[PDB]
C-alpha cells in the first residue's frame, strides 16, 4: 500500500 | 475467343432467340480433361434465358450459334469465363474451359 | 488501529480467494474463445486476449503466495519471492495499461483515416517487462527490530548503492502514477475526443441528401415508407430472386416498410469503407429468415430452394442441407450460429463483391462501448487507492496529537483501494460479458446421424469389427472416428503386406471389375454374387476415384479383409497412386470426410495391396495386361509392390497396358505398340496374348481398367486350346453417372463360367468438389444483392 511495514504493495508497505 | 467444332448436328433451322429458355444437359471439364460438373450426374437439366446476363458470356455465345438438338463442345477462354478470379471450389483460376452441350429444348 | 486489521485479514484473504477462483475460470474461458472460435480472431481481439494473459500469470503465481502472508503476521518467504510477486503486478499493471493505450490507438486509426498487431502485442510485453524490472531489482530483505523483537521486511533498501536507484526511490510515486495512471487516461481521453470531433466534423449533407432524393423518388405514394410494391416499380428488380429477403433485412424494426432512418442504415451495409464483418453479417441475416441469430435446416432449406429454382430435387437438396449442418456444427446444438458461419465461408472473399458508394455509419456503438467499460474499470479499480495515496501526502501528519482518526480513514482507505486493484485483474471478463453482445453469445455457448462410431463401437473383444454395425452407418451417410479409421485401415495394410506378389487362387471364386468409390453399387455387387460370409473374393482393383463415396469402399473392403483376411482378395489397381489420387476427387474427399492423416494412412494401405493372382492354376488375374519385359511368371513373382508405380516399367504395364482396338483381327504381326490414350503402357495384341499363354501354360487372362457398355466382355478364341484368351470385366454401373452402361461379375465354380449383370442404385447427390451448401451459394447471393443495391441508388 502506502505505508511502512512488513508487506510488499503498489505504492509503499503495508503494515 | 469462343469456338464450336461440332459433335453431332441438330435440327439446324432452329436457333435459340433472345427472350426465351434454354433447357440443356451440359459437362464442363477443365483443359486436362477433368470433369468438373456435368448436369447428367442430377438427372435434371438446367434452365437459362438468353438476354438476361445469366450465365457466362462464352456459354451463352455458344448457345447463340448450337441449333436445337446439336451437340457440340465449346471451348471458352478466361476473358468469356470465370476469369482470374474464378469460381470458390469448383474453377481454379485463369482456367480454359471446355463444355459438352448438348441443347434439348427451347421455351 | 489494532481492531481495524483483525477485523480486515479475513476480508483480505476472502478477497484473494474470490480473485484466484474468478481470475483464472474468466480469463481461461475468455483464452478459449479467443483460441476455438474462428471469428474472434479477426479483430483487435486478440489485444484482449493478451490482457488475460496479462491477468493469468498475475493470478496464480501473485495471488496464492500473498494467501499464506495473511495468515503468517510476518514475512515468511525469502528474497526470491520478494524480487517475484511484485515484479508480476507491475508487470501484469504495464500490460494492462499499454493494451488499453495501444487498442484504443488502433482503433482511432480503425475508424478514421495483420503484422504490426503481433509486433505490437510483443512490444507491449517487452516494454511492459522492462519497465518492470527496476522494481524487481529494487527490494531486499532487512532486519532492524520492532522495539525488542527483530524481525525481517521485504521493502526498498532506504539506502541504494547506484544513484539511477536512489532517483527511482526518490520518486518512485509519481513515475507510478504518471505512466500508470495518466497516461492511460490521457491518451484515451484525447483519442476518444479526437474521434469525436472526426464524427463532428466528417458530418456532411452530400451523401444524405443525396439518398434522400432517391428515397423520395422512389417513394411513389410520398408516405414516407418504402413497401414491396414501390421497390419492385423498378423493372431490373422482377428478375431478381432474392428481392424480398433483402426488404425484409432492411427493415430493422419488423412493421414492414423502410422509412428514411433503415433506408441509411440498410445502405450503409454495402459502403466501401464497411467492415468485413457488416457484409458477412448481412449475408447471415439473408439466411436468417426470422432473425433468432442462427441458422437452422428449414431456414437454409428454403433460401436455396428460392435461389436454385426447379433445378434440383427435393431429397438430395435436404440430404446436401443437413450434410452442411451436420459438417458445420462445432457445438451439436443442430443448427448454425454466425461464428460457424463466418469459419466456414470465411475465405470466399465474397465480402469484396457487395461493393456500393456510399459512406454511413452504424457501428462504433459495440466496441466503443467495450473499450470505454475497460478504462473506465481501470480507472475506477485504480482510483480509491491514488486518492488514499493523495490524502496521505496531503493531510497526514504524525506530530498532529490528533492523529488517530486521521489512521482509522487512511488505512481503511488503503485496504478498499488494495481490494479493489486485486478484484480489477478478475472482472474484464465480467464487463467483457456485461457490455459487448459477440463476447456474451461466445461465453454463453462455451460455458452451456452425426454419432461417431469408437473402437469400442466398431472393434469387438476379440479385435475384430462388426461388419454388419458399419455396413449399416456407411449406408446411412455416417462417418467413423479418427482413431478407428486409421486404426482399420493401418492394421489392414499390415495384414496385406504379409501377402505375396502372386496369390494362388482356386475354385470357387468370384471376380469384379473396377468399383470406383461407387459404394452403393458395391453393395448392389455384394447382394447379388452373394455375400462374403460364403463367397470368395477377387477384385480386381480401382477402388476409389470417380465416385463420391471412395472412403466407404475402401473403409468396407479392408474391413472385410480384417475379419476376412483368406477368403477375401484385393489386387492393386492404378488409381492408388498419388499422381491419380491427388488428380481426381479421393484427396478432396479424404480433407472433407476426415482428416489428411486419413488420406496418408489410406495410400499406405494402397502401397501394400498385391499385383496379381494365379486362379485355379488355368488363368491369370491382373488389372490392365501383359508386358513387353514379362515374359513368365517369375517376372511378375519378382515384383517390388511396395512403392509408388514407376512411369515405366512392369509395374506400369500391369497397371495400365490395353488390348488393341481391333485386338483378334489386327493387321502387323507387332505384338506390343505404343499407348497414346493413356499415355503410357502399351497395347498388347493377339499374337502377344496366345505366346504368354503358351509359354506359360496359361488358359486365359482377366483383366479390368476398361470401360464396357455390357460390364464384360470376351475378346477372340484362342486357337491352340478354345477358350476366349482375355476378359474384361467391369463393374461400375453407371460409370461417372453419365455412361449408363450395365455392370457384370465372373463367377467360377465347378468348372462352370457364369457372367451375373447388375445395373446402377441410389445413391445421394453431392456438389461439385464436396463443398457445403454455403459455399456454393455465397458469391450468387453477394452479386445479386449488389445488382439490386447498385439498380436501386446509384441509378
Ligand atoms: C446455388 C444457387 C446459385 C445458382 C446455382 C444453380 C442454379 C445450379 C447451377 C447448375 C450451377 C451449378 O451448381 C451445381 C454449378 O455450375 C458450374 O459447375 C458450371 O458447370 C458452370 O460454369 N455453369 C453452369 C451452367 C451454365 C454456365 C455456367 C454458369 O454461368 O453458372 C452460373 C454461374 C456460377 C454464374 C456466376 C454467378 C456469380 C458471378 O459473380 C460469376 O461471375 C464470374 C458468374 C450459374 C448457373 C448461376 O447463374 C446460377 C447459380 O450460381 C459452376 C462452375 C458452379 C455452379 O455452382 C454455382
Ligand atoms: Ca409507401
Ligand atoms: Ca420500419
Ligand atoms: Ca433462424
Ligand atoms: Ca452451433
Ligand atoms: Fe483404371
Same mark, same amino acid.
Given at each position: 500500500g502506502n505505508w511502512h511495514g512488513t508487506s510488499p504493495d503498489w505504492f509503499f508497505n503495508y503494515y | 475467343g469462343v469456338e464450336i467444332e461440332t459433335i453431332s448436328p441438330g435440327?439446324?433451322?432452329?436457333?435459340?432467340?433472345?427472350?426465351?429458355?434454354?433447357?440443356?444437359?451440359?459437362?464442363?471439364?477443365?483443359?486436362?480433361?477433368?470433369?468438373?460438373?456435368?448436369?447428367?450426374?442430377?438427372?435434371?437439366?438446367?434452365?437459362?434465358?438468353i438476354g438476361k446476363q445469366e450465365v457466362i458470356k462464352g456459354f451463352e455465345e455458344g448457345a447463340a450459334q448450337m441449333?436445337?438438338?446439336?451437340?457440340?463442345?465449346?471451348?471458352?477462354?478466361?476473358?468469356?469465363?470465370?476469369?482470374?478470379?474464378?469460381?470458390?471450389?469448383?474453377?481454379?483460376?485463369?482456367?480454359?474451359?471446355?463444355?459438352?452441350?448438348?441443347?434439348?429444348?427451347?421455351? | 488501529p489494532?481492531?481495524?486489521?483483525?477485523?480486515?485479514?479475513?476480508? !483480505?484473504?476472502?478477497?484473494?480467494?474470490?480473485?484466484?477462483?474468478?481470475?483464472?475460470?474468466? !480469463?481461461?474461458?475468455?483464452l478459449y474463445i479467443?483460441?476455438?472460435?474462428?471469428?474472434?480472431?479477426?479483430?483487435? !481481439?486478440?489485444?484482449?486476449?493478451?490482457? $488475460?494473459?496479462?491477468?493469468?500469470?498475475h493470478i496464480?503465481?501473485?495471488?496464492? %503466495?500473498?494467501?499464506?502472508?495473511?495468515?503468517?503476521?510476518?514475512?515468511?518467504?525469502?528474497?526470491?519471492?520478494?524480487?517475484?510477486?511484485?515484479?508480476?503486478?507491475?508487470?501484469?499493471?504495464?500490460?494492462?495499461?499499454?493494451?488499453?493505450?495501444?487498442?484504443?490507438?488502433?482503433?482511432?486509426?480503425?475508424?478514421?483515416?495483420?503484422?504490426?498487431?503481433?509486433? #505490437? %502485442?510483443?512490444?507491449?510485453?517487452?516494454?511492459?517487462?522492462?519497465?518492470?524490472?527496476? #522494481?524487481?531489482?529494487?527490494?531486499?530483505?532487512?532486519?532492524?527490530?520492532?522495539?525488542?523483537?527483530?524481525?525481517? %521486511?521485504?521493502?526498498?533498501?532506504? @539506502?541504494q548503492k547506484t544513484a539511477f536507484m536512489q532517483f527511482y526511490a526518490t520518486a518512485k510515486d509519481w513515475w507510478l502514477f504518471s505512466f500508470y495512471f495518466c497516461l492511460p487516461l490521457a491518451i484515451t481521453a484525447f483519442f476518444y475526443t479526437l474521434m469525436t470531433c472526426e464524427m463532428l466534423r466528417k458530418k456532411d449533407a452530400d451523401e444524405i441528401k443525396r439518398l434522400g432524393k432517391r428515397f423520395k423518388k422512389l417513394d411513389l405514394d410520398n408516405s414516407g415508407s418504402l413497401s414491396v410494391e414501390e421497390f419492385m416499380s423498378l423493372?431490373?428488380?422482377?428478375?431478381?430472386?432474392?428481392?424480398?429477403?433483402?426488404?425484409?433485412?432492411?427493415?430493422?424494426?419488423?412493421?414492414?416498410?423502410?422509412?428514411?432512418? #433503415?433506408?441509411?442504415?440498410?445502405?450503409?451495409?454495402?459502403?466501401?469503407?464497411?467492415?468485413? #464483418?457488416?457484409?458477412?453479417?448481412? $449475408?447471415?441475416?439473408?439466411?436468417?429468415?426470422?432473425?433468432?441469430?442462427?441458422?437452422?435446416?428449414?431456414?437454409?432449406?428454403?433460401?436455396?430452394?428460392?435461389?436454385?429454382?426447379?433445378?434440383?430435387?427435393?431429397?438430395?437438396?435436404?440430404?446436401?442441407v443437413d450434410k452442411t449442418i451436420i459438417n458445420a456444427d462445432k457445438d451439436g446444438d443442430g443448427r448454425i450460429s454466425f461464428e460457424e458461419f463466418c469459419a466456414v465461408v470465411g475465405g470466399l472473399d465474397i465480402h469484396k463483391k457487395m461493393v456500393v458508394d456510399v459512406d454511413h455509419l452504424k457501428q462504433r456503438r459495440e466496441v466503443a462501448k467495450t473499450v470505454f467499460c475497460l478504462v473506465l474499470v481501470f480507472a475506477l479499480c485504480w482510483l480509491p487507492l491514488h486518492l488514499a495515496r493523495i490524502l496521505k501526502l496531503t493531510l497526514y501528519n504524525q506530530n498532529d496529537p490528533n492523529r488517530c482518526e486521521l489512521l482509522s480513514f487512511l488505512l481503511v482507505l488503503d485496504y478498499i483501494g488494495i481490494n479493489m486493484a486485486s478484484l480489477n485483474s478478475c472482472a474484464n471478463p465480467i464487463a467483457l460479458y456485461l457490455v459487448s453482445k459477440r463476447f456474451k453469445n461466445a461465453f454463453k455457448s462455451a460455458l452451456c446421424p452425426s454419432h461417431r462410431l469408437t473402437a469400442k463401437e466398431v472393434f469387438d473383444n476379440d479385435g475384430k469389427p462388426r461388419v454388419d454395425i458399419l455396413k449399416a452407418h456407411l449406408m446411412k451417410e455416417g462417418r467413423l472416428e479418427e482413431t478407428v479409421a486409421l486404426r482399420i485401415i493401418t492394421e489392414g495394410a499390415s495384414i496385406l503386406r504379409q501377402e505375396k506378389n502372386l496369390l494362388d487362387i482356386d475354385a470357387p471364386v468370384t471376380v469384379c471389375g473396377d468399383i470406383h468409390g461407387q459404394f452403393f453399387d458395391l453393395m448392389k455387387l455384394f447382394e447379388v454374387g452373394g455375400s462374403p460370409a460364403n463367397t470368395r473374393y477377387l477384385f480386381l482393383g480401382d477402388y476409389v476415384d470417380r465416385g463420391y463415396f471412395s472412403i466407404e469402399c475402401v473403409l468396407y473392403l479392408w474391413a472385410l479383409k480384417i475379419l476376412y483376411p483368406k477368403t477375401l482378395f484385393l489386387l492393386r489397381g492404378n488409381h492408388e497412386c498419388r499422381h491419380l489420387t491427388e488428380y481426381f476427387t479421393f484427396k478432396q474427399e479424404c480433407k472433407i470426410k476426415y482428416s489428411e492423416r486419413v488420406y496418408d494412412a489410406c495410400m499406405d494401405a494402397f502401397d501394400c495391396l498385391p499385383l496379381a493372382a494365379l486362379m485355379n492354376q488355368q488363368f491369370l488375374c491382373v488389372h490392365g495386361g501383359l508386358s513387353p519385359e514379362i515374359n513368365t511368371l517369375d517376372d511378375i513373382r519378382k515384383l517390388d509392390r511396395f512403392k509408388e508405380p514407376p512411369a515405366y516399367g512392369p509395374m506400369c504395364d500391369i497397371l495400365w497396358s490395353d488390348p488393341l482396338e481391333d485386338f483378334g483381327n489386327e493387321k502387323t504381326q507387332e505384338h506390343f505398340t505404343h499407348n497414346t @490414350?493413356?499415355?503410357?503402357?502399351?497395347?498388347?495384341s493377339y499374337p502377344a496374348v496366345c505366346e504368354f499363354l503358351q509359354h506359360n501354360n496359361l488358359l486365359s487372362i482377366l483383366r479390368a481398367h476398361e470401360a464396357q457398355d455390357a460390364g464384360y466382355r470376351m475378346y477372340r478364341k484362342s486357337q491352340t486350346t478354345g477358350f476366349?484368351?482375355?476378359?474384361?470385366?467391369?463393374?461400375?454401373?453407371?460409370?461417372?453417372?453419365?455412361?449408363?452402361?450395365?455392370?457384370?461379375?465372373?463367377?467360377?465354380?465347378?468348372?462352370?463360367?457364369?457372367?451375373?449383370?447388375?445395373?446402377?442404385?441410389?445413391h445421394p447427390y453431392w456438389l461439385p468438389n464436396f463443398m457445403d451448401v454455403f459455399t456454393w451459394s455465397l458469391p450468387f447471393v453477394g452479386e445479386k444483392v449488389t445488382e439490386m443495391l447498385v439498380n436501386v441508388l446509384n441509378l
Amino acid at each position: 500500500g502506502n505505508w511502512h511495514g512488513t508487506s510488499p504493495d503498489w505504492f509503499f508497505n503495508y503494515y | 475467343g469462343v469456338e464450336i467444332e461440332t459433335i453431332s448436328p441438330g435440327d439446324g433451322r432452329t436457333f435459340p432467340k433472345k427472350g426465351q429458355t434454354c433447357v440443356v444437359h451440359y459437362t464442363g471439364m477443365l483443359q486436362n480433361g477433368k470433369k468438373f460438373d456435368s448436369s447428367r450426374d442430377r438427372n435434371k437439366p438446367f434452365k437459362f434465358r438468353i438476354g438476361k446476363q445469366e450465365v457466362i458470356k462464352g456459354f451463352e455465345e455458344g448457345a447463340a450459334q448450337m441449333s436445337l438438338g446439336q451437340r457440340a463442345k465449346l471451348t471458352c477462354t478466361p476473358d468469356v469465363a470465370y476469369g482470374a478470379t474464378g469460381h470458390p471450389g469448383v474453377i481454379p483460376p485463369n482456367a480454359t474451359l471446355i463444355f459438352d452441350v448438348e441443347l434439348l429444348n427451347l421455351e | 488501529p489494532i481492531e481495524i486489521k483483525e477485523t480486515f485479514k479475513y476480508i !483480505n484473504t476472502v478477497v484473494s480467494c474470490l480473485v484466484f477462483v474468478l481470475g483464472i475460470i474468466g !480469463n481461461s474461458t475468455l483464452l478459449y474463445i479467443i483460441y476455438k472460435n474462428k471469428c474472434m480472431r479477426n479483430g483487435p !481481439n486478440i489485444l484482449i486476449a493478451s490482457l $488475460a494473459l496479462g491477468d493469468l500469470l498475475h493470478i496464480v503465481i501473485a495471488i496464492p %503466495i500473498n494467501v499464506y502472508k495473511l495468515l503468517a503476521e510476518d514475512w515468511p518467504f525469502g528474497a526470491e519471492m520478494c524480487k517475484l510477486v511484485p515484479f508480476i503486478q507491475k508487470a501484469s499493471v504495464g500490460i494492462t495499461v499499454l493494451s488499453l493505450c495501444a487498442l484504443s490507438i488502433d482503433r482511432y486509426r480503425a475508424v478514421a483515416s495483420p503484422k504490426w498487431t503481433a509486433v #505490437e %502485442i510483443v512490444l507491449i510485453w517487452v516494454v511492459s517487462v522492462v519497465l518492470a524490472v527496476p #522494481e524487481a531489482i529494487g527490494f531486499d530483505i532487512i532486519t532492524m527490530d520492532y522495539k525488542g523483537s527483530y524481525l525481517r %521486511i521485504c521493502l526498498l533498501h532506504p @539506502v541504494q548503492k547506484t544513484a539511477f536507484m536512489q532517483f527511482y526511490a526518490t520518486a518512485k510515486d509519481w513515475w507510478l502514477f504518471s505512466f500508470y495512471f495518466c497516461l492511460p487516461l490521457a491518451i484515451t481521453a484525447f483519442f476518444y475526443t479526437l474521434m469525436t470531433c472526426e464524427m463532428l466534423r466528417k458530418k456532411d449533407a452530400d451523401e444524405i441528401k443525396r439518398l434522400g432524393k432517391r428515397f423520395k423518388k422512389l417513394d411513389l405514394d410520398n408516405s414516407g415508407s418504402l413497401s414491396v410494391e414501390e421497390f419492385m416499380s423498378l423493372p431490373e428488380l422482377q428478375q431478381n430472386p432474392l428481392v424480398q429477403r433483402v426488404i425484409d433485412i432492411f427493415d430493422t424494426d419488423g412493421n414492414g416498410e423502410v422509412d428514411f432512418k #433503415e433506408f441509411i442504415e440498410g445502405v450503409s451495409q454495402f459502403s466501401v469503407k464497411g467492415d468485413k #464483418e457488416q457484409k458477412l453479417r448481412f $449475408a447471415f441475416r439473408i439466411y436468417d429468415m426470422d432473425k433468432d441469430g442462427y441458422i437452422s435446416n428449414g431456414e437454409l432449406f428454403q433460401v436455396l430452394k428460392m435461389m436454385v429454382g426447379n433445378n434440383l430435387k427435393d431429397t438430395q437438396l435436404q440430404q446436401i442441407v443437413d450434410k452442411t449442418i451436420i459438417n458445420a456444427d462445432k457445438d451439436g446444438d443442430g443448427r448454425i450460429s454466425f461464428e460457424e458461419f463466418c469459419a466456414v465461408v470465411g475465405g470466399l472473399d465474397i465480402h469484396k463483391k457487395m461493393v456500393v458508394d456510399v459512406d454511413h455509419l452504424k457501428q462504433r456503438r459495440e466496441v466503443a462501448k467495450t473499450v470505454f467499460c475497460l478504462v473506465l474499470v481501470f480507472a475506477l479499480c485504480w482510483l480509491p487507492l491514488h486518492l488514499a495515496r493523495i490524502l496521505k501526502l496531503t493531510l497526514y501528519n504524525q506530530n498532529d496529537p490528533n492523529r488517530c482518526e486521521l489512521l482509522s480513514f487512511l488505512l481503511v482507505l488503503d485496504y478498499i483501494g488494495i481490494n479493489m486493484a486485486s478484484l480489477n485483474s478478475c472482472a474484464n471478463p465480467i464487463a467483457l460479458y456485461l457490455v459487448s453482445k459477440r463476447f456474451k453469445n461466445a461465453f454463453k455457448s462455451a460455458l452451456c446421424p452425426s454419432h461417431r462410431l469408437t473402437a469400442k463401437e466398431v472393434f469387438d473383444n476379440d479385435g475384430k469389427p462388426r461388419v454388419d454395425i458399419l455396413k449399416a452407418h456407411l449406408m446411412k451417410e455416417g462417418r467413423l472416428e479418427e482413431t478407428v479409421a486409421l486404426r482399420i485401415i493401418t492394421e489392414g495394410a499390415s495384414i496385406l503386406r504379409q501377402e505375396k506378389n502372386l496369390l494362388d487362387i482356386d475354385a470357387p471364386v468370384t471376380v469384379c471389375g473396377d468399383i470406383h468409390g461407387q459404394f452403393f453399387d458395391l453393395m448392389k455387387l455384394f447382394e447379388v454374387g452373394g455375400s462374403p460370409a460364403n463367397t470368395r473374393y477377387l477384385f480386381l482393383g480401382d477402388y476409389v476415384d470417380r465416385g463420391y463415396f471412395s472412403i466407404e469402399c475402401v473403409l468396407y473392403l479392408w474391413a472385410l479383409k480384417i475379419l476376412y483376411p483368406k477368403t477375401l482378395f484385393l489386387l492393386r489397381g492404378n488409381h492408388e497412386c498419388r499422381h491419380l489420387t491427388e488428380y481426381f476427387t479421393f484427396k478432396q474427399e479424404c480433407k472433407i470426410k476426415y482428416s489428411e492423416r486419413v488420406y496418408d494412412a489410406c495410400m499406405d494401405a494402397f502401397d501394400c495391396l498385391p499385383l496379381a493372382a494365379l486362379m485355379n492354376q488355368q488363368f491369370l488375374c491382373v488389372h490392365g495386361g501383359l508386358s513387353p519385359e514379362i515374359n513368365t511368371l517369375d517376372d511378375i513373382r519378382k515384383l517390388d509392390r511396395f512403392k509408388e508405380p514407376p512411369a515405366y516399367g512392369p509395374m506400369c504395364d500391369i497397371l495400365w497396358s490395353d488390348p488393341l482396338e481391333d485386338f483378334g483381327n489386327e493387321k502387323t504381326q507387332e505384338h506390343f505398340t505404343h499407348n497414346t @490414350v493413356r499415355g503410357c503402357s502399351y497395347f498388347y495384341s493377339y499374337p502377344a496374348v496366345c505366346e504368354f499363354l503358351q509359354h506359360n501354360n496359361l488358359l486365359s487372362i482377366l483383366r479390368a481398367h476398361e470401360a464396357q457398355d455390357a460390364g464384360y466382355r470376351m475378346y477372340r478364341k484362342s486357337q491352340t486350346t478354345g477358350f476366349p484368351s482375355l476378359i474384361t470385366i467391369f463393374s461400375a454401373p453407371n460409370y461417372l453417372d453419365v455412361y449408363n452402361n450395365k455392370a457384370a461379375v465372373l463367377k467360377y465354380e465347378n468348372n462352370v463360367m457364369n457372367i451375373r449383370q447388375f445395373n446402377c442404385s441410389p445413391h445421394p447427390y453431392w456438389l461439385p468438389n464436396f463443398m457445403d451448401v454455403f459455399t456454393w451459394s455465397l458469391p450468387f447471393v453477394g452479386e445479386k444483392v449488389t445488382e439490386m443495391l447498385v439498380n436501386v441508388l446509384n441509378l
